């Protein structure tokens, strides 16, 4: 009956492959909840239950392809990775649909804008993101395994807030995979500029080294951490929502804008003084800083961040 039953044996993350078409054609679109250069995200309904339908712009056909491929070839079910249901092509010119678990709270970006956080919620948010990213990053061998995956566009807009107070990571259309069937990596500056690590901006990354891409994600995660920590109240005080580098780059920054801030001037987001009077924010500030080393090799792993966040909690 329910989509969960249908999901409850073989390979991939979502519905059986032929069933993806069937469910996709049974969906009714209700309202657009997101619109961008990516295309659109809609709330839809399948037999009386909400689902999200991302309809890709023709400019982004390749992201649909990559995201679809990943979810259909890797078993990627996890509480903190957006749950995939199906992908479908439908002549309506052909439209490209990615259908996922619907999360009515929307993105972390939107949520942080008119909500401030207690300590519990701050920690739950950042631990959950770390758990998801470590699960992406880790290679698991054997029949229940998965290749390692680096996301390549981690940011607060690509993270969704769940009702249980955790988040999940979405938008795997730029991701790259690393397995034992190791040919070359299938892929330079692809992500969102504001979140690009120095080595992406100066193009020193060794493009065939998977590890290097994980460390790029860690830089971006540090920025997300900062965004979230600003919204946690301590001693009656909180900062307004701002995106990373709000004070030194314009909206929609250029490569040159970012390179000058991050590479040439070696700037990093400022830690508000009030954080040093709070044990949680003090620990988070330390953690952030350990994602932002210029030398990628010194940055903490997602798993280390997760374990550290588990002990602060």
């Amino acid at each position: 009956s329910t989509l969960a039953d249908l999901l409850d044996s073989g390979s991939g993350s979502g519905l059986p492959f032929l069933v993806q078409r069937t469910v996709a054609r049974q969906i009714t679109l209700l309202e657009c909840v997101g619109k961008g250069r990516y295309g659109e995200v809609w709330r839809g309904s399948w037999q009386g239950e909400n689902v999200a339908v991302k309809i890709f712009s023709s400019r982004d056909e390749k992201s649909w392809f990559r995201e679809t491929e990943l979810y259909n070839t890797v078993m990627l079910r996890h509480e903190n990775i957006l749950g995939f249901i199906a992908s479908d092509m439908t002549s309506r010119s052909t439209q490209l649909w990615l259908i996922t678990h619907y999360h009515e709270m929307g993105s972390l970006y939107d949520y942080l804008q008119l909500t401030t956080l207690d300590t519990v919620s701050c920690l739950r948010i950042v631990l959950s993101i770390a758990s998801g990213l470590a699960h992406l990053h880790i290679e698991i061998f054997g029949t229940q395994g998965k290749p390692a995956i680096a996301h390549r566009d981690l940011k607060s807009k690509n993270i969704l807030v769940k009702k249980n107070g955790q988040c999940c990571i979405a938008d795997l259309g730029l991701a790259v995979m690393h397995s034992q069937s190791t040919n070359q990596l299938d892929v330079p500056r692809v992500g969102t500029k504001r979140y690009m690590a120095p080595e992406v901006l100066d193009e020193t990354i060794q493009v065939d080294c998977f590890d290097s891409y994980k460390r790029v994600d860690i830089w971006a995660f540090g920025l997300v951490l900062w965004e979230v920590a600003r919204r946690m109240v301590s001693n009656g005080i909180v900062e307004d929502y701002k995106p990373p580098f709000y004070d030194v780059v314009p909206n929609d920054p250029s490569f040159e804008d970012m390179r000058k801030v991050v590479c040439v001037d070696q700037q990093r987001p400022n830690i508000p003084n009030r954080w040093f009077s709070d044990p949680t924010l003090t620990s988070l500030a330390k953690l952030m800083k350990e994602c932002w080393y210029q030398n990628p090799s010194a940055r903490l792993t997602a798993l280390r961040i997760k374990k550290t966040l588990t002990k602060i909690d």
Binding site: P16, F17, W64
Partner: protein, 108 residues
């Protein structure tokens, strides 16, 4: 029509799918090289789709609509009645001809 049907065992030779009926089938789908890509049999759960509702690739429905109740048959579907030049990422390559071993278990 891009759909060729090779009987494996007969059905009742009388009851064929009609508009609006739910077809209940087992299928195993393979690429031309024999590699299996999907199987309702492996999950022990029959697949259901409604005749005329476009809930399955054209080739699969066209082949099933020619089968009688209980029949089992091999359906070969050219890409133009399956997933075309795009394919289905991570599952079906571009311009793939697909073979389905299908059993028509019931009509509801």
């Amino acid at each position: 029509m891009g759909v060729e049907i090779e009987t494996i065992s007969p059905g009742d030779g009388r009851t064929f799918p009609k508009k609006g009926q739910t077809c209940v089938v087992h299928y195993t789908g393979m690429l031309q090289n024999g590699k299996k890509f999907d199987s309702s049999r492996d999950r022990n759960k029959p697949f259901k789709f409604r005749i005329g509702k476009q809930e399955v690739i054209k080739g699969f429905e066209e082949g099933a609509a020619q089968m009688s109740l209980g029949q089992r048959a091999k359906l070969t579907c050219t890409p133009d009645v399956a997933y075309g030049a795009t394919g289905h990422p991570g599952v079906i390559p571009p311009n793939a001809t697909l073979i389905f071993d299908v059993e028509l278990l019931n009509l509801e």
